[PDB]
Scaffold this active site. Sequence first.
Site, PDB file in Angstrom:
ATOM      1  N   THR C 137       0.974  -2.795  -1.741  1.00 15.94           N
ATOM      2  CA  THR C 137       0.240  -4.018  -2.051  1.00 15.94           C
ATOM      3  C   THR C 137      -0.645  -3.838  -3.279  1.00 15.94           C
ATOM      4  O   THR C 137      -0.680  -4.709  -4.157  1.00 15.94           O
ATOM      5  CB  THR C 137      -0.577  -4.475  -0.836  1.00 15.94           C
ATOM      6  OG1 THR C 137      -1.225  -5.720  -1.130  1.00 15.94           O
ATOM      7  CG2 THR C 137      -1.613  -3.437  -0.416  1.00 15.94           C
ATOM      8  N   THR C 171       0.140  11.418   1.598  1.00 17.29           N
ATOM      9  CA  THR C 171      -0.136  10.736   2.857  1.00 17.29           C
ATOM     10  C   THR C 171       1.071   9.970   3.385  1.00 17.29           C
ATOM     11  O   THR C 171       1.348  10.012   4.588  1.00 17.29           O
ATOM     12  CB  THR C 171      -1.316   9.774   2.692  1.00 17.29           C
ATOM     13  OG1 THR C 171      -2.443  10.485   2.163  1.00 17.29           O
ATOM     14  CG2 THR C 171      -1.699   9.158   4.029  1.00 17.29           C
ATOM     15  N   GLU C 246     -14.230   0.806 -28.852  1.00 18.58           N
ATOM     16  CA  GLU C 246     -14.173   2.066 -29.590  1.00 18.58           C
ATOM     17  C   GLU C 246     -13.618   3.196 -28.729  1.00 18.58           C
ATOM     18  O   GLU C 246     -14.199   4.277 -28.644  1.00 18.58           O
ATOM     19  CB  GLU C 246     -15.560   2.418 -30.113  1.00 18.58           C
ATOM     20  CG  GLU C 246     -16.263   1.277 -30.818  1.00 18.58           C
ATOM     21  CD  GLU C 246     -17.636   1.664 -31.330  1.00 18.58           C
ATOM     22  OE1 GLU C 246     -17.964   2.868 -31.304  1.00 18.58           O
ATOM     23  OE2 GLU C 246     -18.388   0.762 -31.758  1.00 18.58           O
TER      24      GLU C 246
HETATM   25  N1  GTP Z   1      -9.068   8.890  -4.044  1.00 12.84           N
HETATM   26  C1  GTP Z   1      -8.834   8.040  -3.050  1.00 12.84           C
HETATM   27  N2  GTP Z   1      -7.546   7.599  -2.807  1.00 12.84           N
HETATM   28  C2  GTP Z   1      -7.301   6.730  -1.794  1.00 12.84           C
HETATM   29  C3  GTP Z   1      -8.341   6.279  -0.995  1.00 12.84           C
HETATM   30  N3  GTP Z   1      -7.827   5.435  -0.075  1.00 12.84           N
HETATM   31  C4  GTP Z   1      -6.494   5.342  -0.273  1.00 12.84           C
HETATM   32  N4  GTP Z   1      -6.149   6.144  -1.329  1.00 12.84           N
HETATM   33  C5  GTP Z   1      -4.790   6.316  -1.876  1.00 12.84           C
HETATM   34  O1  GTP Z   1      -4.008   5.187  -1.535  1.00 12.84           O
HETATM   35  C6  GTP Z   1      -2.728   5.567  -1.075  1.00 12.84           C
HETATM   36  C7  GTP Z   1      -2.243   4.609   0.010  1.00 12.84           C
HETATM   37  O2  GTP Z   1      -2.645   3.280  -0.254  1.00 12.84           O
HETATM   38  P1  GTP Z   1      -4.004   2.706   0.396  1.00 12.84           P
HETATM   39  O3  GTP Z   1      -5.130   2.755  -0.609  1.00 12.84           O
HETATM   40  O4  GTP Z   1      -4.348   3.494   1.637  1.00 12.84           O
HETATM   41  O5  GTP Z   1      -3.707   1.172   0.785  1.00 12.84           O
HETATM   42  P2  GTP Z   1      -3.179   0.113  -0.307  1.00 12.84           P
HETATM   43  O6  GTP Z   1      -3.339   0.659  -1.706  1.00 12.84           O
HETATM   44  O7  GTP Z   1      -3.931  -1.185  -0.146  1.00 12.84           O
HETATM   45  O8  GTP Z   1      -1.624  -0.104   0.047  1.00 12.84           O
HETATM   46  P3  GTP Z   1      -1.147  -0.399   1.556  1.00 12.84           P
HETATM   47  O9  GTP Z   1      -1.240   0.887   2.342  1.00 12.84           O
HETATM   48  O10 GTP Z   1       0.283  -0.883   1.549  1.00 12.84           O
HETATM   49  O11 GTP Z   1      -2.039  -1.445   2.182  1.00 12.84           O
HETATM   50  C8  GTP Z   1      -2.879   6.987  -0.554  1.00 12.84           C
HETATM   51  O12 GTP Z   1      -1.755   7.764  -0.892  1.00 12.84           O
HETATM   52  C9  GTP Z   1      -4.119   7.525  -1.242  1.00 12.84           C
HETATM   53  O13 GTP Z   1      -3.758   8.457  -2.234  1.00 12.84           O
HETATM   54  C10 GTP Z   1      -9.637   6.718  -1.232  1.00 12.84           C
HETATM   55  O14 GTP Z   1     -10.562   6.320  -0.528  1.00 12.84           O
HETATM   56  N5  GTP Z   1      -9.879   7.600  -2.263  1.00 12.84           N
HETATM   57 MG    MG Z   2      -3.972  -1.314   3.088  1.00  8.31          MG
END
Ligand code: GTP
Ligand code: MG
EC number: 3.6.5.-
Lengths: 430, 50, 431, 430
Positions: C137, C171, C246
């Site tokens: 998403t 993950t 810049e």
């Molecule tokens: N650095 C960091 N990465 C995150 C965090 N939360 C999620 N991610 C990254 O986001 C990836 C998965 O997507 P999510 O952010 O959990 O959720 P989304 O981007 O909304 O996508 P969906 O899971 O389909 O809802 C993971 O592989 C993480 O690497 C965070 O709090 N910090």
């Molecule tokens: Mg999500």
Amino acid sequence: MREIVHIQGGQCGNQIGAKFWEVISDEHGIDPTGTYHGDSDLQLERINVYYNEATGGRYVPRAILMDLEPGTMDSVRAGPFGQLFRPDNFVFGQTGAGNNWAKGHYTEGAELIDSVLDVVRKEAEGCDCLQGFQITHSLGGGTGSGMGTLLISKVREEYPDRIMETFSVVPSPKVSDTVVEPYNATLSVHQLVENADECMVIDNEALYDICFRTLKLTTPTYGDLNHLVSAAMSGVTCCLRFPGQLNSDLRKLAVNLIPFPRLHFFMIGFAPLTSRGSQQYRALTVPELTQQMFDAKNMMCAADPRHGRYLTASALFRGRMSTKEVDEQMLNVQNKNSSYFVEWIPNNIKSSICDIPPKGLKMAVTFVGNSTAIQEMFKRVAEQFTAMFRRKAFLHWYTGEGMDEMEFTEAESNMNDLVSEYQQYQDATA
Amino acid sequence: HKALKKKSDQKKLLDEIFEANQNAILVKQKRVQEEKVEEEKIVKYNLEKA
Amino acid sequence: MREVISIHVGQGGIQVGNACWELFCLEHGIQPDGQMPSDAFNTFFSETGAGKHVPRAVFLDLEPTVIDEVRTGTYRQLFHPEQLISGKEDAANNFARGHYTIGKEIVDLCLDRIRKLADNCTGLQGFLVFNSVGGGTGSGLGSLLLERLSVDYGKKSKLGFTIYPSPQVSTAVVEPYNSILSTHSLLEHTDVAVMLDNEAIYDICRRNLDIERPTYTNLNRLIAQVISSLTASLRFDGALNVDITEFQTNLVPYPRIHFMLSSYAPIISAEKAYHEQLSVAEITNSAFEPANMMAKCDPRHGKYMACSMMYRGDVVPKDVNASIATIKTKRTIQFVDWCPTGFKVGINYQPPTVVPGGDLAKVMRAVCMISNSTAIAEVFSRLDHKFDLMYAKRAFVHWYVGEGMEEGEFSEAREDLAALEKDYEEVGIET
Amino acid sequence: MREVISIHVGQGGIQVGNACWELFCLEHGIQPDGQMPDAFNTFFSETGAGKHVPRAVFLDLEPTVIDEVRTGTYRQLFHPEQLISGKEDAANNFARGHYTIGKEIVDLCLDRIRKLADNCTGLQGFLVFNSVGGGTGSGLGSLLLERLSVDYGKKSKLGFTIYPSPQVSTAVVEPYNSILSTHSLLEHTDVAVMLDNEAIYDICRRNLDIERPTYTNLNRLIAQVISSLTASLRFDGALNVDITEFQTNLVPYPRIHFMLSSYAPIISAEKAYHEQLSVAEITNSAFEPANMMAKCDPRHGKYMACSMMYRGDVVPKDVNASIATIKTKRTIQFVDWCPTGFKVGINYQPPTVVPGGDLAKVMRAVCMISNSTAIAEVFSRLDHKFDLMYAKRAFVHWYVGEGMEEGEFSEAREDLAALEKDYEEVGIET
Ligand SMILES: Nc1nc2c(ncn2[C@@H]2O[C@H](COP(=O)(O)OP(=O)(O)OP(=O)(O)O)[C@@H](O)[C@H]2O)c(=O)[nH]1
Ligand SMILES: [Mg+2]
Ligand SMILES: Nc1nc2c(ncn2[C@@H]2O[C@H](COP(=O)(O)OP(=O)(O)OP(=O)(O)O)[C@@H](O)[C@H]2O)c(=O)[nH]1
Ligand SMILES: Nc1nc2c(ncn2[C@@H]2O[C@H](COP(=O)(O)OP(=O)(O)O)[C@@H](O)[C@H]2O)c(=O)[nH]1
Ligand SMILES: [Mg+2]
């Protein structure tokens, strides 16, 4: 006019100059702030010889202080009269040579000496009429014994017509403070004999003897030694910066004291030096003071002058005098010890008079003697050098910094030769 | 005066840099505590599972 | 009279926008309720006429849990009620779902909010966007927003803070596909793209901060500190200011190469910074240390193209130049042949602010570096290998085919990645 | 603007570094927390506020001593990442500490050394402390010396090795690693000082009147010796000596760089002040054959060099008078190729006294570092002990199983034989 500029390097030279200019400042009545406060008008009329003038009536030393370590100059700047020296003339290193002649003359000194040579040439060109140069150094320290004679060489090819005097402190075998003293004394003498217009030998052991026995004071100090050295140095030029019946400059002394160009190593003496208890005893007179001058015990060296014949003698009498019994006593001394005087030089004593006596004293004598007794220090130094070099002891630094044993051999042969012809004329007869 | 100003500014900077060291004297003690808390959680998990 | 608009899409994007917004509010002195406890805030906030301040941010998500958490947290009164766009059905890590099926009905409202916010601004500097690449998403919505904005506004600058997956720590199991698709989408549409992988920050926290069991909050706080260091020049007086425009005057030699990696210093626990002087030389050495890089890449494996670095505090330009001279003298770091000087320096007077209960402390000197170098080809190569390993057998392709995406969409992304790697290889050779 | 970096590896090295660091802090007025309630720059560095971070590094693979130091009263003084602590002890195995587990620690040690040296601008050199009778200490010291000799090159390094007693031993395999470390450091250490424990035990028994001594007293005496050696760099003196000014005066040849130290006076406060502690008697006690910290007989060999430092209100004439008496003495003879072998240093700062210690304060102290030809006896006895167990190849498998080659002992044996032959060749007169 006919002024001279001061250059001091190494710890010993710096600490000598520290007392020398305290003495000269007290002599001219200059306060430690560079402000004139004298009482006699003459105190300023030739104050330009050792001082340059700055705006505001202030007087600045014409001395250049140079060293491979800044500790001694940082310490002397906090001492009395230390603020006089111009900070621009101070030049110092950050490594040090560790009493090693090779490090002080080949690796670090050659690169470092550019700035001090720049300041030296600037000061010399700034002077109205250049008379000569004076250096104070000790031959017992490797770093100093290196860059002092190095600067002597490179001032020599640049100003071949000017006169130069060095006050050399040689390491005596009695009071030894460093084990590599024979090596650096050898390397320093080898270069000093070639370029030194004048050299004046000073011995700390003889300083110890004279302070022990003449003043009869319990606890001698380097301060007392420096005071004696400074008084002797000032007596050399006394008639030059104040009037006398006989004006006789350093170059006068050169003309009348050195018979042959390579014989330019002399011995210094000063009188009077009386104990505090006997200071009120002594009957200050020209005959007594001059006989006190020619005693073998008044010298600041180890060479017993009665073991040889004086090539020539020079006496600088200081005070308000007349010349008559001065001359007759000179004649009496030359007749009485005629056995100790080499015969093919009749009237081998010079007399000069300066009208103003030393500050704190009504009558004084400065004696410089060219004698055939000086061979002894060279002989003992060469004996120690060959004893320590026959087994190549501690030669590894000198070999590892670009210098080789061929230069050591050449130096040893050179001073062996020098001793040979310097003793040769002692046995010469007409 | 310039030397005094520079020395005073430096000295005040020193009293300010007595400070991202004491902070994680505290924070590093907290981190060791949190590692011990993770160990305690592992112990509780093992006890409950057994 | 200068403004910038911030976009936060995805779970990670929202969680990092929240973290940056506590830090901005604390730095500007704005209370959680938005009131004044008692004019540089104009960069990030807008005056309503009397009282509270409205941040210039937008939040998007199709999963309502995080939006509800934000609206029920202590910051309910800060954000505008109708700018936190929340959907009903999550894309479930499917890029096609968020790019072709359910993101289209939300992107219209998002553009409505964006134009409503842009109408207020008069000196709009540009847009910043935050989104997790490993989420379907987030990737789809970010790509669609970039596509719409690039035609709606045109030359306005956009900076994307993408959080790429770790080389081996992951993950999910299908994230390479949507990562490659989003990279293909944003390659021709993002002016600046900063790599923000999580494994490097984990290692940094373990080594310097001495954090052995970390969570996402520390990572988001570090990212917030980096953003604040980047954006402090626009709202704080400094001896040498640098604007957003810049950036790729100095960091991007060619339009295709716009991916760069960041580092910050002193990123150290608050245990050994009082007991050392925090000299500019040692802080810029720590920043240039390969082990202190905030992205999991080895700068020693490639040449350097450009480095734009900002100091904040009581730093001295003479000391900065002296440190740069030492860095240039150092042999372990070599620049490309056609770049004699590649260092851009910025200076700001405001020291970084400290958040209560956080890990970082208050220091009088800090530096943030943004480096573009030729060594970043390794992450692209490993992502390409991972994508090919699963694309050989057409694994998980049906989940994207059934959402309206064509079969050939992956081939063009693969070709674009190969061309980009070839471009890096061609740039990296000397003349 | 002068600095020196200290290395402490092994249990004994850490225990003696701790002891020297209480003494340095007390002498500089630094509190246990470090907070002062500019001569410190030689040993300390300005960490900004209050305390001063020592220019020292601690290494050990056994974490007990490191944990004790980090839990003691000096936890706030030392940086934590310079107290490098491992996980597995070498268990007195030289091969384990030189080939197996020290290689993963030496990289961090070199990183810390580089970080510490980058701050210094006038780095004088490095001092290293390590127990030779321990496998991990010997291996880590050898590896660090080999790495530093190529990393820095000409920088001076001084090693204070604690050789095993002629008959008193704690372990049973220490001759092997002692010979191995000596072979490693012979071509890698510029100066090596012997500090065996039996001589210090005898000194404590005879002078300190202690019948139950411990390691703390030995470490305190070693700390006092180090302070006497290094006080010249941070205290003003009439005759200063630098670290680089050592092996022009103590090392005739690069191979011979092992020497022994003596200190005077050593006496308790209960009867210290019944005698004047004159310079002559203290320098006689220092030269006494029963007052060395190395269990060797100087009457069995010739003297090559002696560099001695006086601290207090010494007078140079008194020093020369004492040296003259020592030279006149017949029981002490110097080698033929050395006319003068005495180097003298002068410092004004009296030694500091630690509360609760054994030694009483002295307004007069002397510390001598002497290189002589009589040290061949310890090498001969160590060689005999090594050969006794190497005849039957005892305990060789424990080293063979750690990656060490079989022939590594043979070259060390040959090097020891060549070194003994070199001493014999040097000791003969011309
Ligand atoms: N650095 C960091 N990465 C995150 C965090 N939360 C999620 N991610 C990254 O986001 C990836 C998965 O997507 P999510 O952010 O959990 O959720 P989304 O981007 O909304 O996508 P969906 O899971 O389909 O809802 C993971 O592989 C993480 O690497 C965070 O709090 N910090
Ligand atoms: Mg999500
Ligand atoms: N003078 C003195 N020598 C010590 C001291 N501690 C240990 N030693 C010497 O060190 C030798 C044994 O090595 P240790 O210092 O105990 O430990 P190590 O050097 O780290 O080597 P390992 O035992 O393998 O860990 C003994 O034979 C002692 O002679 C001490 O406090 N003072
Ligand atoms: N008269 C006097 N002689 C000194 C003094 N200090 C040192 N010396 C002599 O100088 C010699 C050592 O010189 P050194 O310091 O090594 O000279 P440097 O190497 O140029 O610094 C010693 O033998 C001393 O006899 C002092 O203050 N006064
Ligand atoms: Mg041990």
